[PDB]
Amino acid sequence: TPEMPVLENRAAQGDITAPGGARRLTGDQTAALRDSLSDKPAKNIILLIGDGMGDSEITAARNYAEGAGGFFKGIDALPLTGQYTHYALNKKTGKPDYVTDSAASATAWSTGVKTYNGALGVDIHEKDHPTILEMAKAAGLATGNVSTAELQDATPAALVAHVTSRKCYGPSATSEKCPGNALEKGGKGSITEQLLNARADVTLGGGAKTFAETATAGEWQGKTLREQAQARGYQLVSDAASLNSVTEANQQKPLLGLFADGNMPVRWLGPKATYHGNIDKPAVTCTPNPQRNDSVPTLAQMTDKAIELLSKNEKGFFLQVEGASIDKQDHAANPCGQIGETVDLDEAVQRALEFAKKEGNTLVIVTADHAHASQIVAPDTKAPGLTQALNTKDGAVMVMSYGNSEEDSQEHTGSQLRIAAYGPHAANVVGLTDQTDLFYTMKAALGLK
Amino acid sequence: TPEMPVLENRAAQGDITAPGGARRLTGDQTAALRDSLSDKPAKNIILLIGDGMGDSEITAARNYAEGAGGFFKGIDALPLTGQYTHYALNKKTGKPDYVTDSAASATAWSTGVKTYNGALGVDIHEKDHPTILEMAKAAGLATGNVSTAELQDATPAALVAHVTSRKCYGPSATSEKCPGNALEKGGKGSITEQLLNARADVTLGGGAKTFAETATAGEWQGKTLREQAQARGYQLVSDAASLNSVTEANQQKPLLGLFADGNMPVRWLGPKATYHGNIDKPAVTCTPNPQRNDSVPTLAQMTDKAIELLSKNEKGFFLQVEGASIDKQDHAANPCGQIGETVDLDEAVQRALEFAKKEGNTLVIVTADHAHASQIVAPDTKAPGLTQALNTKDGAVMVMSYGNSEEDSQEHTGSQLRIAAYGPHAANVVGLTDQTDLFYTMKAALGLK
Ligand SMILES: [Mg+2]
Ligand SMILES: [Mg+2]
Ligand SMILES: [Zn+2]
Ligand SMILES: [Zn+2]
């Protein structure tokens, strides 16, 4: 509908060296804003998560791929923007823990309650809390869970599982790590077991590896989780081709795609940032991954398939899309990997926006779980940590730094960060909010009880 | 009668450990946002700058001072938010320079043109461009310029001075670094000298030192600039009581407050962050700076006095307020200084909002020139840089890290950052914009030609 608009052009108007040439706006937005506000109920919800995608990561990625005066057709097109907080809680004391992990953050938007790092779908008292997927499902809507990581990973895992520790991937690990959740100790089961129970109509991602573990107890005891899956009515697919065959997805024949043993492959490769790399070493240009594959769906691809199959439900749908790898490449101090996964996500955002634009009753939300390590610094910067200089699209050099861990892994950060939305109820992300608010915002737009 | 609502309370609504207690919203925001949209003209403009105050610096200060679930009654209360980019240009190539200084950034917002780091009121070709202040004055509007740094520093300087280098504080430095601007070589002058010609109605801050230099030429050759200003009819005050006593400020009786030889005293004392400081050292608790004085007006005080004086103007006013020390103490790796300076800013913001709420035709802007070093990390972090643990309001420990420079100074950072606003034309800050767009936004809002 021309009704609800999106930002079509927020790129620099003309000559950046000229007066007004770097402007992103062409006029007054008061009208456009007014036209972007609606209190009408959302039919569908599409939630796009860039793991570790703070403002720094978004900026670094635009600078490189689109130029400083560039514009992300996906990411940057959402008209309603704000800043949200995502601190976690300390388990013993219930006091704030300023820097969160993806387990606690994902638990917050999915169930509306703060938790401790490590936790999936449980409060600090280790008490379960229904998730937005379980609720929408209960309400009879179609549910989708898509990611580029292993599906046991914290991010997607939070919509479907309740464990006291994100490490409880399969039975083997649960029994050890989460004994109270272990199927044999009377628990609800491991992350994978719980995923299977949940039954979203569409689930696409990696982590096929744990689907090889074997049930210790229950009905499917002694079989492989994968085996239990087909046993359960589930349709399994492992490549683009097959994923494309799929004409229908639902509770009868829910869909489960396992495109990789672990995380799906990264789009771009580059060297790892090194100490004084922006000085001692030359500017880098990122190399697309020759080992990415025509048979592996891109995220924008799982996204479009997900939308087509979930859109066949007349009551509506809930969809969660995760761009997993941003956070993981940030940890590895790999600019090229971190950047490409941001660009990968933008493509999916575009698909989601396109659908919402025409559909008209769709709420699209784009955000991150927490902030990361990456910073953009001056080119002649002499940093204590890991640095790298990059040749951007503007023909200039950009330098990225990761200086918050002497360890082998760059740490997350607690800075508040961008949240953007388009469609009905999107005004609920404007200004300062908390990660938990997102739950109530979503459940409220759909009218979930 | 606040036609347009400001956000009265977005602190966590209840018990942070319980379902929905960490929420900052109490309901749907649609109607309130709708109520924040107006395209009526703006009588006045109050622009508040926290130098180097990125989203990280804000989060950090809130956690410390108000708690994670806290809310800055000033800073966090502006209902229309977005993110803005502030890259500068490379003088020679004209290509983007990812990390700006304060000089080129304030030039951006004050003239609508991008320029090279170090430049004030001039473009890459060193051409001069009229400033939003000079233009307001020209239209008959009352003008103000308040800052906690020396008045010759880039932020305030940019509004009334045009020079090739930011270093050109007074006659002596200008002759050496800005030979083209030097009074004696037929130039327009040094920063202080043009500041004096600019004749803003209200100018309050530090930098008294440079006023002890003597003109090298012109009508006031051989007299100090202090005398020249007295000679030119400026009202000079240097203490809080002298300032309070002021009843008038206009083109006839311009006001000049010089409250510190250099920069004004910082609000809180604390030790410098250090290597492995969060491990090898006990947690720090900020303490008020005894020097902060009673003879010294605070940022909130000057902001109040300036609005009073400026408000007298029928046509209206444009006022810039700078919390300068946030950036400075960030370069210094001093969390208490940095945070204290952000708290100071919040108080100045509250004053501006109170008046604006009242007046009804005032546009209030809160943003920063660029991003900075500061990162919030896990308590157990083992960082290559400077860290420090802090005892927050929540009775918990927060660790701050500075790791982008092996130099004495920590660096500015390239990330886009929060921009927020309240009042008529406030919508122009939502979504993604450029710093230069702000120039155009204040121009149209005040109806300038
Ligand atoms: Mg993730
Ligand atoms: Mg400044
Ligand atoms: Zn994460
Ligand atoms: Zn600075």
Swiss-Prot record, chains A, B:
Pfam families: Alk_phosphatase. One of its GO terms (biological process) is protein dephosphorylation. Gene3D superfamilies: Alkaline Phosphatase, subunit A. Binds 1 Mg(2+) ion. Its EC number is 3.1.3.1. Zn(2+) 1 binds at D327, H331, H412. The active site is at S102. Belongs to the alkaline phosphatase family. This is Alkaline phosphatase. It comes from Escherichia coli (strain K12). The lineage of its organism: Bacteria, Pseudomonadati, Pseudomonadota, Gammaproteobacteria, Enterobacterales.
